[PDB]
């Protein structure tokens, strides 16, 4: 809890629910605000500002969520 404000623009499509401490499979990071990952067998784009890559020394490209977020339109 206690995450920053969302960006002005938006990717434009379907997203994926993320929870604080969840490991989402990084797919695309072309954007510095929206990162496309896969969680709960679902692919979508989430705000990187809410999550944070996890590379302590494993090699695999995985990112951990910092703040809980849920799709809302």
């Amino acid at each position: 809890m206690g995450a920053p404000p969302l960006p002005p623009y938006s990717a434009g499509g379907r997203e994926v629910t993320m929870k604080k401490g969840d490991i989402l499979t990084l797919l695309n990071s072309t954007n510095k605000d929206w990162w496309k990952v896969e969680v709960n067998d679902r692919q979508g784009f989430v705000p990187a500002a809410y999550v944070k890559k996890l590379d302590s020394g494993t090699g695999k490209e995985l990112v951990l969520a910092l703040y809980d977020y849920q799709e809302k339109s």
Side-chain angles (χ1 to χ4, degrees):
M1 212 265 259
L6 276 141
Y9 316 105
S10 31
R14 292 276 181 289
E15 306 164 307
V16 294
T17 318
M18 45 169 269
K19 274 189 297 294
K20 170 263 209 281
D22 214 354
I23 305 170
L24 301 86
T25 307
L26 210 305
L27 296 173
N28 269 127
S29 38
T30 67
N31 267 84
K32 304 270 272 294
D33 280 326
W34 298 101
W35 269 13
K36 192 90 88 66
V37 301
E38 172 169 277
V39 62
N40 277 225
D41 317 82
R42 294 279 176 73
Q43 73 86 44
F45 54 97
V46 281
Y50 274 42
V51 302
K52 178 157 82 169
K53 45 155 182 180
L54 216 145
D55 310 306
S56 273
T58 170
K60 224 101 179 137
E61 300 203 276
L62 66 154
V63 305
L64 166 139
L66 309 174
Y67 313 84
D68 177 35
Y69 173 65
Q70 45 276 302
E71 308 99 339
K72 194 197 273 272
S73 60

Short mmCIF file of all heavy atoms in Angstrom, two decimals:
data_model
loop_
_atom_site.label_atom_id
_atom_site.label_comp_id
_atom_site.label_asym_id
_atom_site.label_seq_id
_atom_site.Cartn_x
_atom_site.Cartn_y
_atom_site.Cartn_z
N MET A 1 0.83 -1.20 0.00
CA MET A 1 0.00 0.00 0.00
C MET A 1 0.86 1.26 0.00
O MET A 1 2.01 1.23 0.46
CB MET A 1 -0.93 0.01 1.21
CG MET A 1 -2.26 0.70 0.96
SD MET A 1 -2.25 2.42 1.48
CE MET A 1 -3.12 2.31 3.05
N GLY A 2 0.31 2.35 -0.52
CA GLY A 2 1.05 3.60 -0.57
C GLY A 2 1.86 3.74 -1.84
O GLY A 2 3.04 4.08 -1.79
N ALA A 3 1.23 3.48 -2.98
CA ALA A 3 1.90 3.58 -4.27
C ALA A 3 1.66 4.95 -4.90
O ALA A 3 0.72 5.67 -4.56
CB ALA A 3 1.43 2.48 -5.20
N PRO A 4 2.53 5.32 -5.86
CA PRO A 4 2.43 6.60 -6.56
C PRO A 4 1.22 6.66 -7.50
O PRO A 4 0.58 5.64 -7.79
CB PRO A 4 3.73 6.66 -7.37
CG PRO A 4 4.13 5.24 -7.56
CD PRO A 4 3.67 4.51 -6.32
N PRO A 5 0.91 7.87 -7.98
CA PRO A 5 -0.22 8.08 -8.89
C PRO A 5 0.02 7.48 -10.27
O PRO A 5 1.16 7.44 -10.75
CB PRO A 5 -0.32 9.61 -8.98
CG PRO A 5 1.06 10.09 -8.67
CD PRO A 5 1.63 9.11 -7.68
N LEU A 6 -1.05 7.02 -10.91
CA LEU A 6 -0.95 6.42 -12.24
C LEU A 6 -0.54 7.47 -13.27
O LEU A 6 -0.70 8.67 -13.07
CB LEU A 6 -2.29 5.79 -12.63
CG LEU A 6 -2.53 4.37 -12.12
CD1 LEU A 6 -3.98 4.20 -11.69
CD2 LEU A 6 -2.16 3.35 -13.18
N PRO A 7 -0.01 6.99 -14.41
CA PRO A 7 0.43 7.87 -15.50
C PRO A 7 -0.75 8.54 -16.21
O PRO A 7 -1.91 8.17 -16.04
CB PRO A 7 1.15 6.91 -16.45
CG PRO A 7 0.55 5.58 -16.18
CD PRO A 7 0.20 5.57 -14.72
N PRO A 8 -0.44 9.55 -17.04
CA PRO A 8 -1.45 10.29 -17.79
C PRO A 8 -2.08 9.45 -18.90
O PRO A 8 -3.30 9.40 -19.04
CB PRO A 8 -0.67 11.46 -18.39
CG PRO A 8 0.74 10.97 -18.47
CD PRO A 8 0.92 10.05 -17.30
N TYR A 9 -1.24 8.79 -19.69
CA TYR A 9 -1.71 7.95 -20.78
C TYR A 9 -1.96 6.52 -20.31
O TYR A 9 -1.94 6.24 -19.11
CB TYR A 9 -0.70 7.95 -21.93
CG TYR A 9 -0.15 9.33 -22.25
CD1 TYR A 9 1.13 9.69 -21.87
CD2 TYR A 9 -0.92 10.26 -22.93
CE1 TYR A 9 1.64 10.94 -22.16
CE2 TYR A 9 -0.43 11.51 -23.23
CZ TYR A 9 0.85 11.85 -22.84
OH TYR A 9 1.35 13.10 -23.14
N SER A 10 -2.19 5.62 -21.26
CA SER A 10 -2.45 4.22 -20.94
C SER A 10 -2.14 3.33 -22.13
O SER A 10 -2.28 3.74 -23.29
CB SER A 10 -3.90 4.03 -20.51
OG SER A 10 -4.75 4.96 -21.16
N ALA A 11 -1.71 2.10 -21.85
CA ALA A 11 -1.39 1.15 -22.90
C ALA A 11 -2.52 1.03 -23.91
O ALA A 11 -2.38 1.40 -25.08
CB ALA A 11 -1.07 -0.21 -22.30
N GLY A 12 -3.66 0.50 -23.46
CA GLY A 12 -4.80 0.34 -24.33
C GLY A 12 -5.12 -1.11 -24.62
O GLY A 12 -4.86 -1.61 -25.72
N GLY A 13 -5.67 -1.81 -23.62
CA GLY A 13 -6.00 -3.21 -23.79
C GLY A 13 -6.39 -3.87 -22.49
O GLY A 13 -7.00 -3.24 -21.62
N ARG A 14 -6.05 -5.15 -22.35
CA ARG A 14 -6.38 -5.90 -21.14
C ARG A 14 -5.17 -5.96 -20.20
O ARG A 14 -4.03 -6.07 -20.65
CB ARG A 14 -6.83 -7.31 -21.50
CG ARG A 14 -8.17 -7.36 -22.23
CD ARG A 14 -9.33 -7.33 -21.25
NE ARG A 14 -10.62 -7.40 -21.94
CZ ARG A 14 -11.13 -6.41 -22.66
NH1 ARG A 14 -10.46 -5.27 -22.79
NH2 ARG A 14 -12.31 -6.55 -23.25
N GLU A 15 -5.44 -5.90 -18.90
CA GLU A 15 -4.38 -5.95 -17.90
C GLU A 15 -4.49 -7.21 -17.06
O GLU A 15 -5.30 -8.09 -17.34
CB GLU A 15 -4.45 -4.71 -17.00
CG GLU A 15 -4.44 -3.40 -17.76
CD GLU A 15 -4.90 -2.23 -16.91
OE1 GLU A 15 -5.99 -2.33 -16.30
OE2 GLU A 15 -4.16 -1.22 -16.84
N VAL A 16 -3.65 -7.30 -16.03
CA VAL A 16 -3.65 -8.46 -15.15
C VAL A 16 -3.52 -8.04 -13.69
O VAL A 16 -2.64 -7.25 -13.34
CB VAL A 16 -2.51 -9.43 -15.50
CG1 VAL A 16 -2.73 -10.05 -16.87
CG2 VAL A 16 -1.16 -8.72 -15.44
N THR A 17 -4.39 -8.58 -12.84
CA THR A 17 -4.37 -8.26 -11.42
C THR A 17 -3.06 -8.69 -10.78
O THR A 17 -2.55 -9.78 -11.05
CB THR A 17 -5.54 -8.94 -10.68
OG1 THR A 17 -6.74 -8.84 -11.45
CG2 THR A 17 -5.76 -8.30 -9.31
N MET A 18 -2.51 -7.83 -9.92
CA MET A 18 -1.26 -8.12 -9.24
C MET A 18 -1.37 -7.84 -7.74
O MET A 18 -2.10 -6.94 -7.33
CB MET A 18 -0.12 -7.29 -9.84
CG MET A 18 -0.49 -5.84 -10.07
SD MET A 18 0.94 -4.82 -10.48
CE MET A 18 1.43 -4.26 -8.85
N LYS A 19 -0.66 -8.62 -6.94
CA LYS A 19 -0.68 -8.46 -5.49
C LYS A 19 0.72 -8.20 -4.95
O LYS A 19 1.71 -8.70 -5.49
CB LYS A 19 -1.27 -9.70 -4.83
CG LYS A 19 -2.79 -9.69 -4.74
CD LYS A 19 -3.31 -10.83 -3.89
CE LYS A 19 -2.97 -12.18 -4.50
NZ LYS A 19 -3.66 -12.40 -5.80
N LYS A 20 0.80 -7.41 -3.89
CA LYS A 20 2.08 -7.08 -3.27
C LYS A 20 2.82 -8.35 -2.85
O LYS A 20 2.40 -9.05 -1.94
CB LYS A 20 1.87 -6.18 -2.06
CG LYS A 20 3.12 -5.99 -1.22
CD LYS A 20 3.15 -6.93 -0.03
CE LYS A 20 3.91 -6.34 1.14
NZ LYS A 20 5.39 -6.45 0.96
N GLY A 21 3.93 -8.63 -3.53
CA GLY A 21 4.71 -9.82 -3.22
C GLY A 21 4.51 -10.93 -4.22
O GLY A 21 4.99 -12.05 -4.02
N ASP A 22 3.79 -10.63 -5.30
CA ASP A 22 3.52 -11.62 -6.34
C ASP A 22 4.60 -11.59 -7.42
O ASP A 22 5.11 -10.52 -7.76
CB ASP A 22 2.15 -11.38 -6.96
CG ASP A 22 1.46 -12.66 -7.37
OD1 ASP A 22 2.09 -13.74 -7.26
OD2 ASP A 22 0.28 -12.60 -7.78
N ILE A 23 4.94 -12.76 -7.95
CA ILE A 23 5.95 -12.86 -8.99
C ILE A 23 5.32 -12.95 -10.37
O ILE A 23 4.74 -13.97 -10.73
CB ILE A 23 6.86 -14.08 -8.77
CG1 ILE A 23 7.48 -14.04 -7.37
CG2 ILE A 23 7.95 -14.13 -9.83
CD1 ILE A 23 8.19 -15.32 -6.98
N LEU A 24 5.43 -11.87 -11.14
CA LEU A 24 4.87 -11.83 -12.49
C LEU A 24 5.96 -12.06 -13.54
O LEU A 24 7.04 -11.48 -13.46
CB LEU A 24 4.18 -10.49 -12.73
CG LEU A 24 3.04 -10.14 -11.78
CD1 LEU A 24 3.58 -9.48 -10.52
CD2 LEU A 24 2.02 -9.24 -12.47
N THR A 25 5.66 -12.91 -14.51
CA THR A 25 6.61 -13.21 -15.58
C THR A 25 6.75 -12.03 -16.54
O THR A 25 5.81 -11.68 -17.25
CB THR A 25 6.18 -14.46 -16.37
OG1 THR A 25 5.96 -15.56 -15.48
CG2 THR A 25 7.24 -14.83 -17.40
N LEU A 26 7.93 -11.43 -16.55
CA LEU A 26 8.19 -10.29 -17.43
C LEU A 26 8.20 -10.72 -18.89
O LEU A 26 8.90 -11.65 -19.27
CB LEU A 26 9.53 -9.64 -17.07
CG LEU A 26 9.65 -8.14 -17.33
CD1 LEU A 26 9.31 -7.83 -18.78
CD2 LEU A 26 8.74 -7.37 -16.39
N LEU A 27 7.41 -10.02 -19.71
CA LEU A 27 7.33 -10.33 -21.13
C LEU A 27 7.91 -9.20 -21.97
O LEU A 27 8.78 -9.42 -22.81
CB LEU A 27 5.87 -10.58 -21.53
CG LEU A 27 5.20 -11.80 -20.90
CD1 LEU A 27 3.72 -11.83 -21.24
CD2 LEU A 27 5.88 -13.08 -21.34
N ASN A 28 7.43 -7.98 -21.73
CA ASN A 28 7.90 -6.81 -22.46
C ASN A 28 8.01 -5.60 -21.53
O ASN A 28 7.15 -5.37 -20.69
CB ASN A 28 6.96 -6.49 -23.62
CG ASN A 28 7.37 -7.19 -24.90
OD1 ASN A 28 6.56 -7.88 -25.53
ND2 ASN A 28 8.63 -7.02 -25.29
N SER A 29 9.09 -4.83 -21.70
CA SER A 29 9.31 -3.65 -20.88
C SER A 29 9.66 -2.44 -21.75
O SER A 29 10.35 -1.52 -21.31
CB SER A 29 10.44 -3.91 -19.88
OG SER A 29 11.46 -4.69 -20.45
N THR A 30 9.17 -2.46 -22.99
CA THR A 30 9.43 -1.37 -23.92
C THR A 30 9.08 -0.02 -23.30
O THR A 30 9.69 1.00 -23.63
CB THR A 30 8.63 -1.54 -25.23
OG1 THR A 30 7.23 -1.40 -24.96
CG2 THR A 30 8.90 -2.91 -25.85
N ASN A 31 8.10 -0.02 -22.41
CA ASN A 31 7.67 1.20 -21.74
C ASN A 31 8.30 1.32 -20.36
O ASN A 31 8.63 0.32 -19.73
CB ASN A 31 6.14 1.23 -21.62
CG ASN A 31 5.48 1.96 -22.78
OD1 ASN A 31 5.25 1.38 -23.84
ND2 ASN A 31 5.18 3.24 -22.58
N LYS A 32 8.47 2.56 -19.90
CA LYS A 32 9.06 2.81 -18.59
C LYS A 32 7.98 3.01 -17.53
O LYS A 32 8.28 3.22 -16.36
CB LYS A 32 9.97 4.04 -18.65
CG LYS A 32 11.06 3.95 -19.70
CD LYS A 32 12.33 3.33 -19.14
CE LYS A 32 13.24 4.38 -18.53
NZ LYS A 32 13.78 5.31 -19.56
N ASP A 33 6.73 2.94 -17.96
CA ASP A 33 5.60 3.11 -17.05
C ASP A 33 4.72 1.87 -17.03
O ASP A 33 4.24 1.45 -15.97
CB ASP A 33 4.77 4.33 -17.45
CG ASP A 33 5.38 5.63 -16.98
OD1 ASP A 33 5.99 5.64 -15.89
OD2 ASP A 33 5.26 6.65 -17.70
N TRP A 34 4.51 1.28 -18.20
CA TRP A 34 3.69 0.08 -18.32
C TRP A 34 4.53 -1.12 -18.75
O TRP A 34 5.19 -1.08 -19.79
CB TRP A 34 2.56 0.31 -19.32
CG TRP A 34 1.62 1.40 -18.91
CD1 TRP A 34 1.60 2.69 -19.37
CD2 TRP A 34 0.56 1.31 -17.95
NE1 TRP A 34 0.60 3.40 -18.76
CE2 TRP A 34 -0.06 2.58 -17.88
CE3 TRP A 34 0.07 0.28 -17.14
CZ2 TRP A 34 -1.14 2.84 -17.04
CZ3 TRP A 34 -1.00 0.54 -16.30
CH2 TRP A 34 -1.59 1.81 -16.26
N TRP A 35 4.50 -2.18 -17.95
CA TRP A 35 5.26 -3.38 -18.25
C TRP A 35 4.33 -4.57 -18.48
O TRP A 35 3.45 -4.85 -17.67
CB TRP A 35 6.23 -3.70 -17.11
CG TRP A 35 7.58 -3.07 -17.29
CD1 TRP A 35 7.92 -2.09 -18.19
CD2 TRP A 35 8.77 -3.37 -16.56
NE1 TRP A 35 9.25 -1.77 -18.05
CE2 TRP A 35 9.79 -2.54 -17.06
CE3 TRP A 35 9.08 -4.26 -15.52
CZ2 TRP A 35 11.09 -2.58 -16.56
CZ3 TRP A 35 10.37 -4.30 -15.03
CH2 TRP A 35 11.36 -3.46 -15.55
N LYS A 36 4.53 -5.26 -19.60
CA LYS A 36 3.71 -6.42 -19.94
C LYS A 36 4.25 -7.68 -19.29
O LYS A 36 5.36 -8.12 -19.59
CB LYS A 36 3.65 -6.60 -21.46
CG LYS A 36 2.59 -7.59 -21.91
CD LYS A 36 1.26 -6.90 -22.18
CE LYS A 36 1.17 -6.39 -23.60
NZ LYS A 36 1.15 -7.50 -24.59
N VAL A 37 3.47 -8.26 -18.38
CA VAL A 37 3.87 -9.48 -17.69
C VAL A 37 2.74 -10.50 -17.67
O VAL A 37 1.65 -10.25 -18.19
CB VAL A 37 4.30 -9.18 -16.24
CG1 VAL A 37 5.46 -8.19 -16.22
CG2 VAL A 37 3.13 -8.65 -15.43
N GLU A 38 3.01 -11.66 -17.07
CA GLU A 38 2.01 -12.72 -16.98
C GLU A 38 1.85 -13.20 -15.54
O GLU A 38 2.83 -13.59 -14.90
CB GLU A 38 2.40 -13.89 -17.89
CG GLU A 38 1.51 -15.11 -17.71
CD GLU A 38 1.75 -16.16 -18.79
OE1 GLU A 38 1.16 -16.02 -19.88
OE2 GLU A 38 2.51 -17.11 -18.54
N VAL A 39 0.62 -13.18 -15.05
CA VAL A 39 0.34 -13.62 -13.68
C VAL A 39 -1.00 -14.34 -13.61
O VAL A 39 -1.95 -13.98 -14.31
CB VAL A 39 0.33 -12.43 -12.70
CG1 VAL A 39 -0.77 -11.44 -13.07
CG2 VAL A 39 0.15 -12.92 -11.27
N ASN A 40 -1.08 -15.35 -12.75
CA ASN A 40 -2.31 -16.12 -12.58
C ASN A 40 -2.79 -16.67 -13.91
O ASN A 40 -3.99 -16.71 -14.18
CB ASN A 40 -3.39 -15.25 -11.95
CG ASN A 40 -3.27 -15.17 -10.44
OD1 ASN A 40 -4.26 -15.29 -9.71
ND2 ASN A 40 -2.05 -14.97 -9.95
N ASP A 41 -1.85 -17.09 -14.75
CA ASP A 41 -2.18 -17.64 -16.06
C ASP A 41 -2.86 -16.59 -16.94
O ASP A 41 -3.64 -16.92 -17.83
CB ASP A 41 -3.09 -18.86 -15.91
CG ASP A 41 -2.64 -19.78 -14.80
OD1 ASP A 41 -2.97 -19.50 -13.62
OD2 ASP A 41 -1.97 -20.79 -15.10
N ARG A 42 -2.55 -15.32 -16.68
CA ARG A 42 -3.13 -14.22 -17.44
C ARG A 42 -2.05 -13.24 -17.88
O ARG A 42 -1.17 -12.88 -17.10
CB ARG A 42 -4.19 -13.50 -16.61
CG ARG A 42 -5.40 -14.35 -16.30
CD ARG A 42 -6.38 -14.38 -17.47
NE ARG A 42 -7.50 -15.28 -17.22
CZ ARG A 42 -8.49 -15.00 -16.37
NH1 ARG A 42 -8.49 -13.86 -15.70
NH2 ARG A 42 -9.48 -15.87 -16.20
N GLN A 43 -2.12 -12.81 -19.13
CA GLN A 43 -1.15 -11.86 -19.68
C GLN A 43 -1.75 -10.46 -19.78
O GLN A 43 -2.89 -10.29 -20.22
CB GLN A 43 -0.67 -12.33 -21.05
CG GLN A 43 -1.71 -12.16 -22.15
CD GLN A 43 -1.69 -10.77 -22.76
OE1 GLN A 43 -0.62 -10.22 -23.05
NE2 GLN A 43 -2.87 -10.20 -22.97
N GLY A 44 -0.98 -9.46 -19.37
CA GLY A 44 -1.45 -8.09 -19.43
C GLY A 44 -0.35 -7.09 -19.14
O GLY A 44 0.82 -7.46 -19.01
N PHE A 45 -0.72 -5.82 -19.04
CA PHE A 45 0.24 -4.76 -18.77
C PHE A 45 -0.06 -4.08 -17.44
O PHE A 45 -1.18 -3.63 -17.20
CB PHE A 45 0.23 -3.72 -19.90
CG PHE A 45 -1.14 -3.16 -20.18
CD1 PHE A 45 -1.52 -1.95 -19.64
CD2 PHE A 45 -2.03 -3.85 -20.98
CE1 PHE A 45 -2.78 -1.43 -19.89
CE2 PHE A 45 -3.29 -3.33 -21.24
CZ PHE A 45 -3.66 -2.12 -20.70
N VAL A 46 0.95 -4.01 -16.58
CA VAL A 46 0.80 -3.38 -15.27
C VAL A 46 1.80 -2.25 -15.08
O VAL A 46 2.86 -2.21 -15.72
CB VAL A 46 0.98 -4.40 -14.13
CG1 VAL A 46 -0.29 -5.24 -13.96
CG2 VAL A 46 2.18 -5.30 -14.40
N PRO A 47 1.47 -1.31 -14.18
CA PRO A 47 2.33 -0.16 -13.89
C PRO A 47 3.60 -0.56 -13.14
O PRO A 47 3.55 -0.99 -11.99
CB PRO A 47 1.45 0.73 -13.00
CG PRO A 47 0.48 -0.22 -12.37
CD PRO A 47 0.23 -1.30 -13.39
N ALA A 48 4.74 -0.42 -13.81
CA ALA A 48 6.03 -0.76 -13.21
C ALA A 48 6.24 -0.01 -11.90
O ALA A 48 6.94 -0.49 -11.01
CB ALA A 48 7.16 -0.47 -14.18
N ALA A 49 5.63 1.17 -11.79
CA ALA A 49 5.76 1.98 -10.59
C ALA A 49 5.15 1.28 -9.38
O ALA A 49 5.40 1.66 -8.24
CB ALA A 49 5.10 3.34 -10.81
N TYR A 50 4.35 0.25 -9.64
CA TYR A 50 3.70 -0.50 -8.58
C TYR A 50 4.48 -1.77 -8.26
O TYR A 50 4.35 -2.34 -7.18
CB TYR A 50 2.27 -0.86 -8.97
CG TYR A 50 1.26 0.23 -8.65
CD1 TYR A 50 1.56 1.57 -8.89
CD2 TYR A 50 0.02 -0.08 -8.11
CE1 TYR A 50 0.64 2.56 -8.60
CE2 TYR A 50 -0.89 0.91 -7.81
CZ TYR A 50 -0.58 2.23 -8.06
OH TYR A 50 -1.49 3.21 -7.77
N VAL A 51 5.30 -2.21 -9.21
CA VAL A 51 6.11 -3.41 -9.03
C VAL A 51 7.59 -3.09 -9.05
O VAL A 51 7.99 -1.92 -9.11
CB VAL A 51 5.80 -4.46 -10.12
CG1 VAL A 51 4.33 -4.82 -10.12
CG2 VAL A 51 6.23 -3.94 -11.49
N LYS A 52 8.42 -4.12 -9.01
CA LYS A 52 9.87 -3.95 -9.03
C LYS A 52 10.57 -5.25 -9.41
O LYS A 52 10.35 -6.29 -8.79
CB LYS A 52 10.36 -3.47 -7.66
CG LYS A 52 11.87 -3.31 -7.58
CD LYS A 52 12.28 -2.35 -6.48
CE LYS A 52 12.30 -3.03 -5.12
NZ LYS A 52 12.93 -2.18 -4.08
N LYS A 53 11.42 -5.19 -10.43
CA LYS A 53 12.16 -6.36 -10.89
C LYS A 53 12.88 -7.03 -9.73
O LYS A 53 13.31 -6.37 -8.78
CB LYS A 53 13.16 -5.96 -11.97
CG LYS A 53 13.96 -4.71 -11.63
CD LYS A 53 15.30 -4.69 -12.35
CE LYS A 53 16.12 -3.47 -11.97
NZ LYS A 53 17.43 -3.44 -12.68
N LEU A 54 13.01 -8.35 -9.81
CA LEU A 54 13.69 -9.12 -8.77
C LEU A 54 14.85 -9.92 -9.34
O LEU A 54 14.66 -11.01 -9.89
CB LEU A 54 12.70 -10.06 -8.08
CG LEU A 54 12.90 -10.27 -6.58
CD1 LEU A 54 11.56 -10.43 -5.87
CD2 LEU A 54 13.79 -11.47 -6.32
N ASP A 55 16.06 -9.37 -9.22
CA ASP A 55 17.25 -10.04 -9.73
C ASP A 55 18.34 -10.09 -8.66
O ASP A 55 19.36 -9.41 -8.77
CB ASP A 55 17.77 -9.32 -10.97
CG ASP A 55 16.68 -9.08 -12.00
OD1 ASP A 55 16.02 -10.06 -12.40
OD2 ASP A 55 16.50 -7.92 -12.41
N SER A 56 18.11 -10.88 -7.62
CA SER A 56 19.07 -11.02 -6.53
C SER A 56 20.28 -11.84 -6.97
O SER A 56 21.38 -11.68 -6.43
CB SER A 56 18.41 -11.67 -5.32
OG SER A 56 17.78 -10.70 -4.50
N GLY A 57 20.07 -12.71 -7.95
CA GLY A 57 21.15 -13.55 -8.44
C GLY A 57 20.67 -14.90 -8.93
O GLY A 57 21.26 -15.93 -8.62
N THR A 58 19.58 -14.89 -9.70
CA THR A 58 19.02 -16.12 -10.23
C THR A 58 19.16 -16.18 -11.74
O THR A 58 19.31 -17.26 -12.32
CB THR A 58 17.53 -16.26 -9.85
OG1 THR A 58 16.94 -17.35 -10.58
CG2 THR A 58 16.77 -14.98 -10.15
N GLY A 59 19.10 -15.02 -12.39
CA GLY A 59 19.22 -14.97 -13.83
C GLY A 59 17.88 -14.81 -14.52
O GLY A 59 17.72 -13.96 -15.40
N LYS A 60 16.92 -15.63 -14.13
CA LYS A 60 15.58 -15.58 -14.72
C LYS A 60 15.02 -14.16 -14.67
O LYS A 60 15.28 -13.42 -13.72
CB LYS A 60 14.64 -16.54 -13.98
CG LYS A 60 13.75 -17.35 -14.91
CD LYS A 60 14.28 -18.76 -15.09
CE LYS A 60 13.38 -19.58 -16.01
NZ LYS A 60 14.17 -20.38 -16.99
N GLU A 61 14.25 -13.80 -15.69
CA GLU A 61 13.66 -12.47 -15.77
C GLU A 61 12.30 -12.45 -15.07
O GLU A 61 11.26 -12.64 -15.71
CB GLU A 61 13.51 -12.04 -17.23
CG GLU A 61 14.82 -11.96 -17.98
CD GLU A 61 14.75 -11.05 -19.19
OE1 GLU A 61 14.30 -11.51 -20.26
OE2 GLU A 61 15.15 -9.87 -19.06
N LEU A 62 12.31 -12.21 -13.77
CA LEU A 62 11.08 -12.16 -12.99
C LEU A 62 10.99 -10.86 -12.19
O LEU A 62 12.01 -10.30 -11.78
CB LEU A 62 11.01 -13.35 -12.03
CG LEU A 62 12.06 -13.39 -10.92
CD1 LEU A 62 11.54 -14.18 -9.73
CD2 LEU A 62 13.36 -13.98 -11.43
N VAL A 63 9.77 -10.38 -11.98
CA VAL A 63 9.55 -9.15 -11.23
C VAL A 63 8.54 -9.36 -10.11
O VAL A 63 7.57 -10.10 -10.26
CB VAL A 63 9.04 -8.02 -12.15
CG1 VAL A 63 9.99 -7.82 -13.32
CG2 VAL A 63 7.64 -8.32 -12.64
N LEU A 64 8.78 -8.71 -8.98
CA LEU A 64 7.89 -8.83 -7.82
C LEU A 64 7.07 -7.56 -7.64
O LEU A 64 7.57 -6.45 -7.82
CB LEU A 64 8.71 -9.11 -6.56
CG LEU A 64 7.97 -8.92 -5.23
CD1 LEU A 64 8.33 -10.03 -4.26
CD2 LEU A 64 8.29 -7.56 -4.63
N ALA A 65 5.80 -7.73 -7.28
CA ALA A 65 4.91 -6.60 -7.07
C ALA A 65 5.15 -5.95 -5.71
O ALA A 65 5.45 -6.63 -4.73
CB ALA A 65 3.46 -7.04 -7.19
N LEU A 66 5.02 -4.63 -5.66
CA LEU A 66 5.23 -3.89 -4.42
C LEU A 66 3.90 -3.45 -3.82
O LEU A 66 3.71 -3.51 -2.61
CB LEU A 66 6.12 -2.67 -4.67
CG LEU A 66 7.44 -2.94 -5.41
CD1 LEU A 66 8.15 -1.63 -5.72
CD2 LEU A 66 8.33 -3.85 -4.58
N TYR A 67 2.99 -3.00 -4.68
CA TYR A 67 1.68 -2.55 -4.23
C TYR A 67 0.57 -3.32 -4.94
O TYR A 67 0.69 -3.67 -6.11
CB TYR A 67 1.52 -1.05 -4.49
CG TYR A 67 2.70 -0.23 -4.05
CD1 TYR A 67 3.82 -0.07 -4.86
CD2 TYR A 67 2.71 0.40 -2.80
CE1 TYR A 67 4.90 0.68 -4.46
CE2 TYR A 67 3.80 1.15 -2.39
CZ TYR A 67 4.89 1.29 -3.22
OH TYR A 67 5.97 2.04 -2.82
N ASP A 68 -0.51 -3.58 -4.21
CA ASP A 68 -1.65 -4.31 -4.77
C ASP A 68 -2.40 -3.46 -5.78
O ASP A 68 -2.65 -2.27 -5.54
CB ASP A 68 -2.59 -4.76 -3.65
CG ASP A 68 -3.83 -5.46 -4.18
OD1 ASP A 68 -3.72 -6.17 -5.20
OD2 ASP A 68 -4.91 -5.29 -3.58
N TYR A 69 -2.76 -4.06 -6.91
CA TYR A 69 -3.48 -3.35 -7.96
C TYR A 69 -4.48 -4.27 -8.65
O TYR A 69 -4.26 -5.48 -8.76
CB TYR A 69 -2.50 -2.78 -8.98
CG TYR A 69 -3.18 -2.16 -10.19
CD1 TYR A 69 -3.98 -1.03 -10.06
CD2 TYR A 69 -3.02 -2.71 -11.46
CE1 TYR A 69 -4.59 -0.47 -11.16
CE2 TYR A 69 -3.63 -2.15 -12.56
CZ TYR A 69 -4.42 -1.03 -12.41
OH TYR A 69 -5.03 -0.47 -13.50
N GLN A 70 -5.58 -3.69 -9.11
CA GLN A 70 -6.62 -4.46 -9.80
C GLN A 70 -7.22 -3.67 -10.95
O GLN A 70 -7.48 -2.47 -10.82
CB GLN A 70 -7.72 -4.86 -8.81
CG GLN A 70 -8.16 -3.73 -7.90
CD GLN A 70 -7.26 -3.57 -6.69
OE1 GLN A 70 -7.08 -4.50 -5.91
NE2 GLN A 70 -6.69 -2.38 -6.53
N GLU A 71 -7.44 -4.34 -12.07
CA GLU A 71 -8.01 -3.69 -13.25
C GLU A 71 -9.29 -2.95 -12.90
O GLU A 71 -10.13 -3.46 -12.16
CB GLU A 71 -8.29 -4.73 -14.34
CG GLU A 71 -7.09 -5.61 -14.67
CD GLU A 71 -7.16 -6.96 -13.99
OE1 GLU A 71 -7.88 -7.08 -12.98
OE2 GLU A 71 -6.49 -7.90 -14.47
N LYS A 72 -9.43 -1.74 -13.43
CA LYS A 72 -10.61 -0.92 -13.17
C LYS A 72 -10.89 0.02 -14.33
O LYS A 72 -10.06 0.87 -14.66
CB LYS A 72 -10.43 -0.12 -11.88
CG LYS A 72 -11.72 0.50 -11.36
CD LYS A 72 -11.44 1.61 -10.36
CE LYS A 72 -11.30 1.06 -8.94
NZ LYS A 72 -12.62 0.99 -8.25
N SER A 73 -12.05 -0.14 -14.95
CA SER A 73 -12.44 0.70 -16.09
C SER A 73 -13.80 1.33 -15.85
O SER A 73 -14.68 1.27 -16.71
CB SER A 73 -12.45 -0.12 -17.37
OG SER A 73 -13.37 -1.20 -17.28
#
